[PDB]
Each structure stands twice: as C-alpha cells, then as structure tokens.
Amino acid sequence: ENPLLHGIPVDVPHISVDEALANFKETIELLLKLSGNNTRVEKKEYSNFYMKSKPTLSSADFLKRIQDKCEYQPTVYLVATFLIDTLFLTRDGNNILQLKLNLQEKEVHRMIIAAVRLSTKLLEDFVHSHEYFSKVCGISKRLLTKLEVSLLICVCNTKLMVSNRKLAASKLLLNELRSF
Amino acid sequence: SSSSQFKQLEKLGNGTYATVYKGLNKTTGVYVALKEVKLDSEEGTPSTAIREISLMKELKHENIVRLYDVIHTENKLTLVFEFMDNDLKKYMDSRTPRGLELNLVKYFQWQLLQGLAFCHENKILHRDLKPQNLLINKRGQLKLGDFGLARAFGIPVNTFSSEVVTLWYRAPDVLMGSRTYSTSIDIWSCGCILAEMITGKPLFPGTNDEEQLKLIFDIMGTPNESLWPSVTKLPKYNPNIQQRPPRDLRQVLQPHTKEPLDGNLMDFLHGLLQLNPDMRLSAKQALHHPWFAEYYH
Ligand SMILES: Nc1ncnc2c1ncn2[C@@H]1O[C@H](COP(=O)(O)OP(=O)(O)OP(O)(O)=S)[C@@H](O)[C@H]1O
Ligand SMILES: [Mg+2]
Structure with missing residues (x-):
C-alpha cells in the first residue's frame, strides 16, 4: 500500500501554514539537487511545467503571494508536497528511497501551481475560481487546465486517496532526505 | 491511455459532469465504460473527476466499480471503467x-x-x-x-x-x-x-x-x-x-x-x-x- 508510506503508523500532525509552506519548498530544493545524480503519454504530459524564461517571482516569494491572495490551511501545502513525493519518489526492496524522475528548476514553477490547486481540489468542497487562481499565478487559464491534467496524469497511478498518513509522510520523507 | 485504444460505442448514460459510452478494447476484446469528462480550458478540470480518479486507485472491492485507465485527449478526459450492464x-x-x-x-x-x-x-x-x-x-x-x-x-x-x-x-x-x-x-x-x-x-x-x-x-x-x-x-x-x-x-x-x-x-x-x-x-x-x-x- 504505497511505498512512500511503508514505515509510517497506519494510525499516525498539527502543523501551521508556515510549517507547511516550509516543508514543500524544502522538498523542492532537495529534489532539484538529488535529481542530477512508465509510459510515453506519461512523459508527454510532463513537458508542461517546463517554462523557458525565468520565473519572475522568486520561488520562495512566489508562494508568499499565493498564501496571501489565497490564504490556505496547512493541509493544502502538505498534500501539495506529497504529490511531488509520490511523483518523484518511491522505496526499494529495502525500503530505501529512490528517484523516479528528474526534477529541474525550469519545471519547478508550473509544478508548484499544479500541486497546490490540484491539492485543494482534493481537499475542499469549495475552492477558488479558475481565474481567481489563474490570476494568482499569472497563468493562462488554458495552461492552468493543462497543468492540472499534466500532474494528475503523471501521478494518477499512485495512491492519491488523501489520509493522515499521506499528510504525515510529507514532512517525514523530508527528513529521510537530509542527513544525521 | 491512447485514444485509439478504445472503440467508442452506444451512449450508456449521463450525469451532471460526464457522459458515459460503452467502449471496446480493440486488443483484449473486452467491453468497458467510457466516462467522458469535458475539459473546457476556460472552466477547468472538474473536481469530480479528480476525486473519482484519486478515490479509485485505492478503493478496490468487488462491490465498487473498477477504474481501469484515464485518457487525456483534446479538451476531454476519459475515465475508463469496468463495464456494467x-x-x-x-x-x-x-x-x-x-x-x-x-x-x-x-x-x-x-x-x-x-x-x-x-x-x-x-x-x-x-x-x-x-x-x-x-x-x-x-x-x-x-x-x-x-x-x-x-x-x-x-x-x-x-x-x-x-x-x-x-x-x-x-x-x-x-x-x-x-x-x-x-x-x-x-x-x-x-x-x-x-x-x-x-x-x-x-x-x-x-x-x-x-x-x-x-x-x-x-x-x-x-x-x-x-x-x-x-x-x-x-x-x-x-x-x-x-x-x-x-x-x-x-x-x-x-x-x-x-x-x-x-x-x-x-x-x-x-x-x-x-x-x-x-x-x-x-x-x-x-x-x-x-x-x-x-x-x-
Ligand atoms: N461502468 C459503467 N457501466 C455501465 N454504465 C455506467 C457505468 N458507469 C456509469 N454508467 C452509467 O452512466 C450514468 C452516469 O455515470 P456517473 O459516473 O454516475 O456520472 P455522474 O455524472 O457523476 O452521475 P451523477 O453525479 O449521479 S448525476 C450512470 O448513472 C450509469 O447509468
Ligand atoms: Mg449517475
């Protein structure tokens, strides 16, 4: 039942938005760096998060804007982060993590939005509008759509059913990436 | 995925967000249900399909319909389900x-x-x-x-x-x-x-x-x-x-x-x-x- 959960109390997280926003950003960097070192439509749908130009809003500040204009609860940014986890990570026969795919900063910016709106759409019986958010991200609502389906397509073969363990694994998988 | 993977057949029904057609897997010969979701670039990806997809790769039981696949073609998301009569x-x-x-x-x-x-x-x-x-x-x-x-x-x-x-x-x-x-x-x-x-x-x-x-x-x-x-x-x-x-x-x-x-x-x-x-x-x-x-x- 989902490798990235193999080793977490099936019981098993009281975190604040700052704590939440922290881990996400964290995981990104780690993934960006650790990357260096199963079908076509999958990769096909992944070409999207890759913007050629340089993200006008610094990655960190960029999320600051969104939490302001959207003011989410910690949950959002946690789930958001697991998608990244589940998208890129997986354990091996010895419960040792491994890299599924290579994550680049050229793809990071759009991947951020994808995970968050997608995340909220998993959580809330009511989210912001498609243009309220398409706005918050300086994104064409046509791309926004393409970036929901892109992510969704890429991770759908993983267990995305939201639950406290998956919520927990966000922060934990972070630790297991560092050292000490 | 792959659209060409399934031959579309007769409409089996519709609801608020989707239209369902009988479908036939061209390879295995087995019939399926093709739940088609409209994807207007202006409104966005429906939360329903998202919930449906996530909640199905995990909910497997003989009394819960099985989701087999999710195809993304032109402005359309098809969720391929097991076929029920x-x-x-x-x-x-x-x-x-x-x-x-x-x-x-x-x-x-x-x-x-x-x-x-x-x-x-x-x-x-x-x-x-x-x-x-x-x-x-x-x-x-x-x-x-x-x-x-x-x-x-x-x-x-x-x-x-x-x-x-x-x-x-x-x-x-x-x-x-x-x-x-x-x-x-x-x-x-x-x-x-x-x-x-x-x-x-x-x-x-x-x-x-x-x-x-x-x-x-x-x-x-x-x-x-x-x-x-x-x-x-x-x-x-x-x-x-x-x-x-x-x-x-x-x-x-x-x-x-x-x-x-x-x-x-x-x-x-x-x-x-x-x-x-x-x-x-x-x-x-x-x-x-x-x-x-x-x-x-
Ligand atoms: N696997 C299947 N096999 C045969 N018929 C199906 C299958 N899935 C759906 N249908 C038919 O298509 C109709 C619409 O399918 P749903 O998945 O219920 O779409 P929906 O728009 O979410 O329906 P709501 O929300 O109840 S109005 C169903 O009521 C069934 O009659
Ligand atoms: Mg119905």
Missing part, C-alpha cells in the same frame, strides 16, 4: 413491476452495504448514493459508482457543502444545515434506496429543500428533541412547527408491493432511516442485522 434505475425500469422481489432486494441491499462498509472502513464518504449510481451486471453483482461527490473524513477541511447528495436521497439533518455529517449521510441514502427497491417508487420525491423535509416528517414524524437533543443545534431547525408522529412504515410501504414486509425487514429499514444521525445503523452493523441471517454461517 445496468444501473439500478434502468434495471428496475426494464422490469416496469416495478418493485423487486424481496430476495433480490435483500441481495442488492446486502451488496450495497458491503461496498459501503468498505468505503467507510477507508474513511471515505460516498455522498451520492442513489439507484443511478449503483451499477448492476449480468452475474447480478452490484457496484457503487460515481465517486465524484466522495470525500475522505477524519481530516481538517475548511469549506462546506450541505448541497451534496441528490435531494431525494439527502438526510434531514443535512437539509437542516448540519455541516458535520459522517457516515450517517450514506446510510440514510441506503434507507431510501431500500424502500425504492421494495415499492418501485422513490420514498421522498421532494422538489425542494422544504418539501423534502415535509415529505420526510410526514412519514418519519417531526424531529423529537427527546430522541435527538442535538437537533436544536441545526440552523434550519424549527421548534415551533406542529408535532407530527411517525407513521407505521410497514403501512406506507406494503400497499406498493405484493410481497409481505416482515418484522426484520421493517426493523432493518427503521435502523437505516433513523432521524437522529447517531442512531442510524452503520454499514458494518447493518450487514449483521438478522434480516441477513440466511447469508451467514
């Missing part, structure tokens, strides 16, 4: 009669509760149980489908919607504004569906929130604070309105079916349709009601 409405319509024999009912309800018990075991609420969303096939299997309104419970969620569950199948406490329903909501639906199967007729054919409550109380009596003290908490609850005692359920039903409604059946039905959310049987304990005795060891 009917839904409960059509099936009953195709017999139009129109209520079912009591061994069929017991057998379909049993399977409803089995699939349901699994959802709840996994902290998942269906929130849209109604005959159109219960698929039946030739072997006679019944499977919950249409998990678009589904939601995981136990977790901190901010936004609210007491506007879930198609009206005829929505619980009184919800109608009155309860934003803290758990599994009791699905159970009420099962109670309605059970009635409908027995008589062939919907139990509470309301045309609006208020007419729905009126219909419920006409039969279940008005809310009785002695039996449901927390009722006073609900925003659309009104104490002043005129009392109204429950009717004898066996009597409101028996007319519409030639089959004799015994004690277990009626009891079992009262357990599902309890006005007080907390008093309604759980799926698990419904499964063990004596009415299902012949199904056991």
